[PDB]
Write a protein that binds this ligand. Structure first.
Ligand SMILES: [Zn+2]
Ligand SMILES: [Zn+2]
Lengths: 579, 151, 340, 93, 134, 423
């Protein structure tokens, strides 16, 4: 997080470093000649002494932000689950008496009102996975007819698990006012045993959503789905991935996603264009499978990390790939806007700069998908068209923010900080616009949690080192927005507020300790704390310790700034975002 | 039917909506009068950009992906008489078209600088030799010794 | 999970529940690659617990790639053995060398591109090298572990030798290749029949002796249909008696192998009693059409499109004396009786 | 398998052994061992069966029998578990 | 103006400027021999395409007086070696073919500008090319 | 005057877009582009100096080969020779090469090996085939390549230089390939061109092919003739010839093939690309007539761009669609065609063509996927199309919906082309 890296680099290496035959930190004057106090003996080519009145640590600190974003706000906040296996309980006598309450708790008319809510509002989510939901009302009828039976077939229990995943998606995206009209809270409190004054907005809707997701997984376990691979497993997981299920159970969602890759690739259908020698039922089956494929590639990229090694997305949207530009733009528009995001977020952990031709190509596809989302139908008698508009517009605003962030970090082009501020205000103005009635639940999609995490973390990081006014007002606005996010995110929202508070206290630490110049590099406790957060969470993401604990009774045996670093890490620990 | 382009100095410029959709950044901003900040562009430069969009309301420009239709496109007579301005204010018009994502103004305003880089005298290419350094003084002496025989 | 599955994969669990075993193997690939350990050589800077742990993952990774190859098919799409480069304690790496050589051989089954003679000769030189390495393994008649170890190594190298000279016989019809096939089939017999005489009959329960005897008795039946020979006939009688004498712990798969050998024996009678015809370029015979349809039916059974249509919901699937002989044989000896 | 009147030539044999290279795969590799034809509408599904089955088969095996099994594995099956678990003396604990 | 696009695109730019060099030699020869009148004195000398005299005998007489009347009384004596003189008249026949092609292109360029005095009669120049080739 | 420093202080996107529209023209001593010299009545002719007599005696025999082309109007040359001292050292020019190489050779096109002034130095030619900038490879690596490759090792490699025979004499081809052999510069070049200004090949072509196996960085091969296209890159039926062919090991290496200026590529019955089994793009630059039914199109090819053509047939998809839904052509033109231009059709204008589309009420969502499978049976996994300047398509143009969206087909110069239907 520290080198010299000043403005107005020199073209050739300086005369002193060629006199000495060493490497040249090719600045003006140098990091290697400023280290020895040879400032005036290196400037004398032209103009001279130029004014380096900027803050020189900032380029190689933004190149550090490209790694800090990946290891904190992507992996350590959402995709890290610290588990000790000696303390975690393990029995199937728990879920057979827990999930039985949640399956007997949902009544019939309550479930049909959930399905009506999905049919009227959530059409942008299931139609990629399951298709039209009027086919699924018959499956809810068959579930309530087969409810009192004793011998259930596997084919029936797959539809049961699919509609319980749909019910989970309904409970997650339902507003509290519509939820209170359907469900009573008091038998649920009599079962769970908690405080009576704990209504749905206070955090019980998330509990009921997580337990309905656990009931969908319990009915998948009653299918014995590993012995019977079927596309309804993939559909149920694509419904469950529309919630905060992949962030509540980030290691269970990776194994289910690996089973969905194994289930999908079992069909051995790589081309989804219907051929001429096909059954007309087989053609519609391959069209539905092609929609499920790109929905699965989206949900497959959104869980990428070290705890998910088996990937599915093997196609590139710019410039050995298999499966792209053969498919019609109806729901690959959700993938083509994420495959355009994968091209940007692959350079986070990667230690190389993206070429500017790639960034210009991505900017051109941004303009094309802007016109393509402006070229959509506006069904004013349908509420799911506005939610599809919000999804496909919030994704292109997110990829626009990330594109101009990487322009700001890697190359520092024309007004790219102002473009970061502009698209951050566009993200705010898309989320604040949903604070009106009839669309308050649009802000519950997990992409707004991911995007607000990235944006408020970068603005809180940039406010530490660059004192500005537009950035400060933007940070006030995102702090208000993070305070006004929906409470169904819960623990991840509290951890995001904690991370923003930690970066603000780190800003207060930055304006206290004087920066230690060292010629070619700088030194500050803020830099060391930021270096150490990545090392801590990379240590938490190292499965060698769980490996040593698994292989038997093997036990793993392993200045002035140090006091400030240790007191800040003991006061504001980075391990408080893992739980 | 009207939007407001707030400049960096704080002036409000009420522009017609169809005319101001020449800017790709504003036409995408309208998916949310409707005001929007343009933080780096002065009032005079933004006024020039708005007058340029007022003339080219009905004009037809290349498809922003063309090989020769974009490079070999000549400037308009209004575009050449329009950009007989100060040099730094010309670059600030280019910066305004780069921020507002107006590709034809970033085309016609940027072929003028290309016509000024070429078409200049070899005497003041000889004069502006190492105004930015780009060469060691040993190499500068070797270059000036290499073509000393002419003059 | 990976260790318990590698213990279960030494039984007929991957053949009793083949779609469950492929899902467990996919979870084992997910669990193993979660550790992100590529190289298994001990580094000098590591904790000496961690180096022994990486050696443990090396010897687990080689066994996992062995089972990963042994469950390769259409119902197992996610692979691990493809990430190990081919060759073209120290007795655990020998098993993976022989299994990787078998992987180099049997990749030419499904593809149509015939192997070069350079490839088969390089596999032959490596086969002689690992044959010397297996013959150099010491063994104690008291220590039954070492006897079963040498039986596994020698049976695997005899299986790879038999498959190599079978590919010599098939792809090139090299002289003195049928004698090598008969010789290594007799070597496989003399390895299996030896276990009945030495009170070590549980050596013949390993899942490699069901696969190898399946391939051998199927090829000798297929070759006795078309190319008559006395040594091949005596070898087929020995294979039939040995298949009758395989242990009952294989269960239904042994009965299905006896059924397949009986079907290929009854198909020899149909090749005898029906004269081969020709149209000037191709040779029409009912035996050929029955052998076409035996692949067509099982490729239809391994087609997950109809299960996809049943899974999507309201989409429902709707569907001379030559042909008479073919349909009567397929109504009498159906190929769908090797299924369960 | 092959590539009107009658004949007795041997053109079918090089085109038929190449057909054996496909038949060996699609019968003896896949269709005999790796193909399990299933019907999901006919297959039962509950956790009211495999719980009591596992309870019986774990309560059936006793303590003295299990160490005799482990001694059999230590004495006779050393070529199998060593790639998976290494030493089985560690597993007595 | 309809034929201008496939007249520019029919040549490489290098070939187009080589041909323009060769017919500029031709038009300079026509002005220094008073075939076409000069427009003025000490100004931009320029001839229209509409009245540029092009014929078989004019092209061949240009070819004579410039290319194959290689007298050069100050530098005639550099044709003693057979290798150098072979290279020199191979250069002569290559420039002969290229100047005939350039003046064919000029005669094709004058027809779109409505020049009635531009007819090549190309079998004559092909006979000249075959003569020097022989 | 113009200020160099103020231009190099403003950021690199604006400098890119300046050096984008500055095509390759760094000098003010440029020839007139060849459209004004022909769309003019007058013919500009030459007709004394004191300093240029020193320049045309000493500087000019160094640049005799590449600049004897401009002997018409020698005012263009005596103006050129003051640029010839100082333009290659200019900060604007070197900044143009810096921002070109920083964008992987996109801005100014195709630096070129040559052999002038006894050095084997690089050269840059503009669109009028005039040199403007000549650098030796030590000087080109020193102050433009190393000046932007500060420490990142993915930008020290310079693999985008064309070789371009027909620029220069076959003796100079031999000498250039020999000096290029004695250095380690075959990985330096990026593509090769071909000339030839009855299967006979020239001497400079054989010299180029016999050292083409040693490239190991060669892509983007291109030819310019027709009687040479039919020999060295077309399949032409022959499949086993050791000598004079283009050495199949280097057929696998190339990315794309440009076909510069011809009459037909299928002069025989089939313009077959059965070999070159690893190419992605194929650009038809000024070929007069091509038939898409006469190109055999390898297993993995993606882009077929084609500019400045005079006649196109098409992939005759209309002949195969009308057999599928089983109607007449006159009933198809007036019954099934919808001509929808909702919002994304109107994005890229195409004000002269009329973009059309099949119905939804007359096709019941089966035999729409079959009507689309006809189109994908004809294209065979290509994506990029890019029709520039064209005229007179014989069959009507048929594009799929999956490829018409996201601007993956792109008709640019629309005057005589019309009525593209999208199915
Ligand atoms: Zn230095
Ligand atoms: Zn220095």
């Amino acid at each position: 997080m520290f080198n010299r890296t000043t403005q107005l680099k020199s073209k050739h290496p300086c005369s002193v470093c060629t006199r000495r035959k060493v490497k040249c930190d090719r600045m003006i004057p140098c990091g290697n000649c400023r280290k020895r106090g040879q400032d005036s003996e290196c400037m004398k080519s032209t103009k001279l002494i130029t004014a380096s009145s900027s803050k020189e640590y900032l380029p190689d600190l933004l190149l550090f932000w490209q790694n800090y974003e990946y290891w904190i706000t992507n992996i350590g906040l959402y995709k890290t689950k610290q588990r000790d296996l000696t303390r975690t309980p393990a029995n199937l006598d728990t879920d057979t008496e827990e999930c039985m309450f949640w399956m007997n708790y949902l009544q019939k008319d309550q479930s049909f009102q959930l399905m009506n809510f999905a049919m009227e509002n959530l059409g942008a989510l299931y139609f990629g996975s399951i298709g039209d939901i009027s086919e699924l009302y018959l499956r809810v009828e068959q579930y309530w007819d087969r409810r009192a039976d004793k011998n259930h077939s596997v084919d029936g229990k797959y539809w049961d698990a699919l509609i319980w995943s749909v019910f989970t998606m309904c409970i997650y995206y339902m507003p509290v006012e519509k939820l209170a009209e359907i469900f009573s809270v008091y038998p649920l409190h009599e079962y769970l045993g908690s405080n009576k004054r704990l209504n749905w907005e206070d955090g019980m809707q998330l509990v009921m959503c997580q337990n309905f997701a656990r009931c969908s997984l319990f009915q998948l376990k009653q299918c014995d789905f590993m012995a019977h691979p079927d596309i309804r497993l993939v559909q149920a997981y694509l419904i469950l991935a529309t919630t905060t299920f992949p962030y509540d159970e980030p290691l269970l969602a990776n194994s289910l996603l690996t089973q969905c890759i194994h289930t999908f690739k079992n069909f051995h259908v790589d081309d989804f264009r219907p051929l001429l020698n096909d059954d007309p039922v087989e053609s519609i089956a391959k069209v539905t499978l092609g929609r499920i494929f790109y929905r699965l590639c989206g949900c497959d990229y959104l869980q990428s990390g070290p705890r998910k090694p088996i990937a599915l997305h093997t196609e590139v949207s710019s410039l050995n790939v298999d499966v792209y530009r053969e498919e019609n733009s109806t729901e690959v528009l959700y993938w083509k806007i994420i495959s355009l995001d994968r091209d940007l977020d692959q350079y986070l952990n990667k230690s190389s700069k993206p070429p500017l031709k790639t960034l210009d190509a991505i900017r051109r596809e941004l303009d094309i998908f802007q016109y393509k989302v402006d070229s959509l139908e506006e069904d004013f008698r349908s509420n799911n068209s506005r939610f599809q508009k919000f999804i496909a517009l919030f994704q292109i605003s997110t990829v626009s923010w990330k594109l101009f962030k990487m322009y700001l970090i890697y190359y520092d082009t024309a007004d790219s900080l102002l473009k970061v501020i502009h698209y951050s205000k566009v993200i705010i103005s898309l989320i604040v616009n949903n604070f009106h009635a009839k669309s308050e639940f649009f802000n519950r999609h997990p992409m707004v949690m991911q995007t607000i995490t990235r944006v408020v973390s970068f603005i809180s990081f940039y406010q530490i080192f660059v004192e500005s006014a537009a950035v400060k007002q933007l940070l006030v606005d995102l702090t208000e927005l993070t305070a006004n996010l929906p409470t169904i995110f819960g623990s991840k929202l509290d951890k995001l507020v904690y991370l923003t508070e930690r970066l603000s206290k780190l800003k207060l630490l930055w304006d206290k300790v004087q920066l230690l110049d060292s010629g070619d590099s700088f030194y500050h406790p803020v830099f060391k704390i930021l270096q150490n957060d990545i090392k801590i969470i990379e240590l938490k993401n190292d499965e060698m310790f769980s490996l040593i604990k698994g292989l038997g009774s093997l036990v793993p045996l392993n200045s002035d700034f140090r006091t400030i670093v240790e007191e800040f890490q003991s006061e504001y620990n980075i391990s408080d975002i893992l739980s | 039917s009207n939007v407001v382009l707030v400049s960096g100095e704080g002036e409000r410029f009420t522009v017609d909506k169809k005319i101001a959709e020449r800017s790709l950044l504003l036409k995408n901003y309208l998916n949310d009068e409707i005001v929007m900040p343009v933080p780096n562009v002065r009032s005079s430069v933004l006024q020039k950009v708005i007058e340029w969009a007022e003339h080219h309301r009905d004009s037809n420009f290349p498809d922003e992906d063309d090989d020769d239709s974009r490079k070999s496109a000549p400037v308009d007579s209004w575009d050449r008489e329009f950009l007989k301005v100060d040099q730094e204010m010309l670059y600030e018009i280019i910066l305004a078209a780069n921020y507002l994502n107006i590709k034809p103004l970033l085309d016609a305003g940027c072929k003028v600088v290309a016509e000024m880089i070429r078409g200049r005298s070899p005497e003041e290419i000889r004069r502006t030799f190492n105004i930015v350094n780009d060469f060691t003084p040993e190499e500068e002496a070797a270059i000036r010794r290499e073509n000393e025989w002419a003059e | 999970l990976v260790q318990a599955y590698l213990i279960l994969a030494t039984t007929t669990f991957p053949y009793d529940e083949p779609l469950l075993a492929n899902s467990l193997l996919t979870q084992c690939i997910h669990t193993f690659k979660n550790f992100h350990v590529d190289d298994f050589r001990p580094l000098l800077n590591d904790d000496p617990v961690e180096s022994i742990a990486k050696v443990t993952l090396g010897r687990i990774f080689y066994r996992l790639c062995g089972c990963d190859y042994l469950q390769s098919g259409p119902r197992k799409p996610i692979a691990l053995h493809t990430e190990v480069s081919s060759l073209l304690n120290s007795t655990e790496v020998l098993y993976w060398k022989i299994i990787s050589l078998d992987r180099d051989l049997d990749q030419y089954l499904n593809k149509s591109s015939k192997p070069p003679l350079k490839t088969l000769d390089a596999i032959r030189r490596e086969l002689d090298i690992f044959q010397y390495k297996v013959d150099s393994l010491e063994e104690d008649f008291r220590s039954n572990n070492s006897r079963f170890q040498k039986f596994i190594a020698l049976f695997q190298i005899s299986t790879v030798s038999w498959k190599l000279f079978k590919m010599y016989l098939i792809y090139y019809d090299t002289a003195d290749s049928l004698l090598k096939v008969i010789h290594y089939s007799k070597v496989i017999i003399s390895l299996i029949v030896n276990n009945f005489h030495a009170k070590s009959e549980f050596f013949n329960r390993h899942p490699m002796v069901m696969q190898t005897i399946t391939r051998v008795v199927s090829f000798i039946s297929f070759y006795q249909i078309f190319v008559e020979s006395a040594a091949v006939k005596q070898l087929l009688v020995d294979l039939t008696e040995l298949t009758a004498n395989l242990p009952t712990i294989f269960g239904s798969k042994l009965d299905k192998l006896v059924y397949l050998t009986e079907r290929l024996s009854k198909l020899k009678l149909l090749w005898d009693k029906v004269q081969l015809l020709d149209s000037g370029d191709s040779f029409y015979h009912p035996v050929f059409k029955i052998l076409q349809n035996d692949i067509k039916i099982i490729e239809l059974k391994n087609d997950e499109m109809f299960s996809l249509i049943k899974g999507l919901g309201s989409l429902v699937p709707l569907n001379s004396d030559f042909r008479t002989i073919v349909e009567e044989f397929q109504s009498e000896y159906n190929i769908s009786d090797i299924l369960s | 398998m092959f590539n009107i009147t009658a004949s007795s030539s041997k053109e079918y044999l090089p085109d038929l052994l190449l057909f054996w290279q496909n038949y060996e795969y699609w019968i003896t590799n896949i269709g005999l061992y790796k193909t399990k034809q299933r019907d999901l509408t006919r297959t039962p599904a509950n956790l009211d069966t495999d719980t009591e089955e596992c309870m019986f088969w774990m309560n059936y095996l006793q303590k003295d029998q299990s160490f005799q099994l482990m001694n059999f594995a230590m004495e006779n099956l050393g070529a199998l578990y060593f790639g998976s678990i290494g030493d089985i003396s560690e597993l007595y604990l | 103006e309809d034929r201008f696009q496939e007249l520019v695109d029919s040549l490489k730019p290098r070939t187009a400027h080589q041909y323009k060099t060769y017919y500029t030699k031709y038009i300079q020869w026509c002005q220094l021999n008073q075939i076409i009148p000069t427009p003025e004195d000490n100004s931009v000398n320029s001839v229209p395409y509409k009245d540029l005299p092009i014929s078989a005998e004019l092209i061949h007489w240009f070819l004579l007086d410039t290319l194959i009347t290689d007298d050069k009384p100050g530098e005639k004596r550099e044709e003693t070696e057979d290798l150098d003189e072979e290279e020199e008249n191979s250069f002569k026949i290559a420039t002969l073919k290229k100047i005939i092609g350039s003046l064919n292109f000029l005669s094709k360029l004058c027809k779109v500008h409505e020049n009635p005095n531009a007819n090549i009669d190309t079998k004559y120049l092909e006979s000249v090319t075959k003569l020097h080739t022989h | 005057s113009f200020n160099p420093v103020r231009f190099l202080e403003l950021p690199i996107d604006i400098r890119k877009e300046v050096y984008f529209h500055l095509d390759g023209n760094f000098c003010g001593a440029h020839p007139y582009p060849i459209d004004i010299l022909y769309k003019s009545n007058d013919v500009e002719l030459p007709g004394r100096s004191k300093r240029s007599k020193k320049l045309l005696r000493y500087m000019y025999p160094v640049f005799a080969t590449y600049l004897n082309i401009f002997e018409y109007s020698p005012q263009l040359i005596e103006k050129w020779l003051e640029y010839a001292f100082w333009l290659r050292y200019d900060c604007l020019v070197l900044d143009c090469f810096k921002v070109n190489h920083l964008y992987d050779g996109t801005l100014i096109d195709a630096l070129e090996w040559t052999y002038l002034d006894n050095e084997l130095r690089l050269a840059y030619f503009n669109k009028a085939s005039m040199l403007e900038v000549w650098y030796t490879f030590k000087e080109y690596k020193k102050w433009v390549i190393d000046s932007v490759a500060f420490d990142e090792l993915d930008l020290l490699n310079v693999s985008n230089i064309q070789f371009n025979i027909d620029n220069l004499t076959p003796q100079l081809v031999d000498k250039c390939l020999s000096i290029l052999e004695q250095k380690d510069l075959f990985a330096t070049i990026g593509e090769v061109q071909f000339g030839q200004d009855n299967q006979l090949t020239s001497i400079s072509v054989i010299r180029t092919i016999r050292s083409m196996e040693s490239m190991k960085s060669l892509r983007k091969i291109t030819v310019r003739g027709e009687k040479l296209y039919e020999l060295l890159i077309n399949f032409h039926g022959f499949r086993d010839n050791p000598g004079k062919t283009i050495s199949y090991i280097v057929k696998r290496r190339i990315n794309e093939i440009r076909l510069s200026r011809m009459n037909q590529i299928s002069r025989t019955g089939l313009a077959d690309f059965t070999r070159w089994d690893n190419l992605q793009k194929l650009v038809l630059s000024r070929v007069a007539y091509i038939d898409l039914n006469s190109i055999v199109f390898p297993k993995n090819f993606k882009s077929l761009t084609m500019k400045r053509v005079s006649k196109i047939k098409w992939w005759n998809i209309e002949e195969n669609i009308l057999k599928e839904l089983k109607v007449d052509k006159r009933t198809f033109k007036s019954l099934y065609i919808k001509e929808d231009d909702s919002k994304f059709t109107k994005f890229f204008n195409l004000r002269h063509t009329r973009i059309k589309e099949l119905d939804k009420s007359e096709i019941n969502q089966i035999t729409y996927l079959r009507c689309q499978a006809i189109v994908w049976l004809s294209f065979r996994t290509l994506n990029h199309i890019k029709l520039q300047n064209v005229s007179e398509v014989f069959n009507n143009i048929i594009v799929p919906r999956a490829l018409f969206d996201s601007k993956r087909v792109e008709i640019y110069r629309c005057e005589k082309i019309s009525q593209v239907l999208v199915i």
